Amino acid sequence: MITKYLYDENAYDYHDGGYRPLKKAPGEEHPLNVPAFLKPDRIEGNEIYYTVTAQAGETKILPGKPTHTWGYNGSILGPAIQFETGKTYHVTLKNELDEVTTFHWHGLNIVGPYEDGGPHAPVYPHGERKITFTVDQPAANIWLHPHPCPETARQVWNGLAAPVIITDGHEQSLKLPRRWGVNDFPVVLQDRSYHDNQLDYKADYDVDGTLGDYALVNGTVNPVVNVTKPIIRLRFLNGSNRREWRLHFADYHPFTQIGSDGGLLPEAVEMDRIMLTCAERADVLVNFSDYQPGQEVILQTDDFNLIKFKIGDIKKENMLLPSPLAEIPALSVDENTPVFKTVMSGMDDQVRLDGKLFDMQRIDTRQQVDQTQIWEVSNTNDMEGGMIHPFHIHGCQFQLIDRNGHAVNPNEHGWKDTIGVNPNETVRIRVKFTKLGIFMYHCHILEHEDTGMMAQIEIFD
């Protein structure tokens, strides 16, 4: 059982001068918002048609005035979007905002740079963009967020993000907690400050990554979950601009991680804490069968109360998973397997990828399709006052080899698309790109990304 946070304590977010801790949001406690699933516009057998509109609205978060928020098909965040492996999807992307945006599917394997929804894929105000893809990757917790250069940090701050679920035959075979909103929860973790009961990104802006005073979970404050059934699935996503989340129950109740960014783990991992850098997902099961019907269990990040689990008339149930949990195909790495070294350096405004800022017309690397590649990703920052950069690659899922030549963390034997790189650390990963086109890689601290800590790979035959 993992009893440690698996990232270097020396480099955590709370060591920075100008680090602002979470504080209690005012008003009554609310039941956790669970977004309803996006309904298909039309289903011609095996082909599904979705419409996703970026739009401004008003959300009751704090008591008093409603907050002016941006959302997808709603006032804030978006609906749950279900994809199935094998199915083909025709998505209409509509921009009903008064500025340019983009529709990036973080963790989806699709052609770039237009289908992918990078900064080369603008949708102009009152504009329409139709895309077509076939989902061909395992069941995973994925997400959609705007990705225009360099307005990404602000557009996510204003509320544009949506949890996305890929499901497959195998994941359904496990018979996990499936009752959406009772058994099975999306937990989108965000942090926002309010003045006038309103968002103001310019006011709160930090170059080194913007922090919020109040914890936003699925766009609700002071969230509560009423445990009907004892075994509950929590699909954690760190949707924050910069803030790391060090999740644990107040009494360090154990829980089981079953999923990473790119699908189910090969084996279930028991633990009593977990740390998520930006854009990382953790799929965990919690057995509340342990507690009595009248009790209250509080989920915390550090010493801050995040979400209260009010246990109701619960019936005893033993939580048993298979070993192995899932079969992950190993990528074959031989002696003539090409290596590519990328160096994350600098902090605040001095942040660089291989010493360069992002240019939309410059291709930084070129790699071959369907041939597995090794990547040495290095964080050059000083272990003294350094920073954990969450490194992400578009249009793929990769496997870890080592962290500084040593063994990989217990929750990284599966598929990932973003990894936290500690100061003075070089991570070894192997990746086989399946789709042709131009793809981006960058730090997933949205202010570092906006500054230009981003580069482009072309994939060719």
Contacting residue, 188, 247, 282, 445, with Cu ion by CB under 5 A: 445
CB of 62 to Cu ion, least distance (A): 27
Query: Contact letters (x/-) for Cu ion, 268-307, by CB under 5 A?
Result: -----------x----------------------------
- Identity of the residue, 103 or 255, whose beta carbon is nearer to Cu ion in the bound complex: 103
> Least Å distance between CB 267 and Cu ion?
27
Q: In whole angstroms, how close is the CB of 436 to Cu ion at the nearest point?
A: 17
CB of 394 vs Cu ion, minimal distance in Å: 5
In whole angstroms, how close is the CB of 171 to Cu ion at the nearest point? 22
Q: Which is nearer to Cu ion, 19 or 49 (CB)?
A: 19
Distances (CA, A) of 17 to 12, 169, 231, 386, 407: 12, 48, 40, 12, 32
Q: Minimal distance in Å, beta carbon 392 to Cu ion?
A: 5
One of 281, 448, 451, 456 touching Cu ion (CB under 5 A): 448
CB-wise, 435 or 448, nearer to Cu ion? 448
Euclidean distance between the first and the last CA atom of the chain, given in angstroms as a whole number: 45
Which one, 279 or 282, has the nearer CB to Cu ion? Answer: 279
Toward Cu ion, which CB reaches closer, 279 or 299? 279
Q: Per rule CB under 5 A, is residue 106 in the interface with Cu ion?
A: yes
CA atoms within 13 A on the CB side of 450: 22
Q: Pick the closest to residue 144 from 176, 195, 186 (CA basis).
A: 186
Question: Which residue is nearest to Cu ion, using beta carbons?
Answer: 443
Which region, judged by CB under 5 A, interacts with Cu ion, from 45-53, 185-193, 195-203, 392-400? 392-400
Q: Does 389 bind Cu ion (CB under 5 A)?
A: yes
**Runs of H (alpha helix) within 146-227:** 152-157, 169-173, 201-204
- Bridge partners, 455 (sequence order): 441
371 DSSP β-pair partners: none
Q: Is 243 in the site for Cu ion (CB under 5 A)?
A: no
Strand residue runs (E) in 290-443: 296-301, 304-311, 339-345, 352-353, 365-368, 373-379, 389-393, 399-403, 418-421, 425-431, 437-443
- Sheet with 231-238, side-by-side order of all strands: 214-217, 184-192, 231-238, 281-287, 255-260, 263-271
Q: Which stretch binds Cu ion (CB under 5 A): 84-92, 266-274, 315-323, 393-401?
A: 393-401
Fill in the amino acid letter for 326.
A
List strands edge to edge, sheet with 339-345.
352-353, 339-345, 373-379, 425-431, 399-403
Of 8 and 290, the one with the shorter C-beta distance to Cu ion is 8
**What residues line the site for Cu ion (CB under 5 A)?**
106, 279, 389, 394, 443, 445, 448
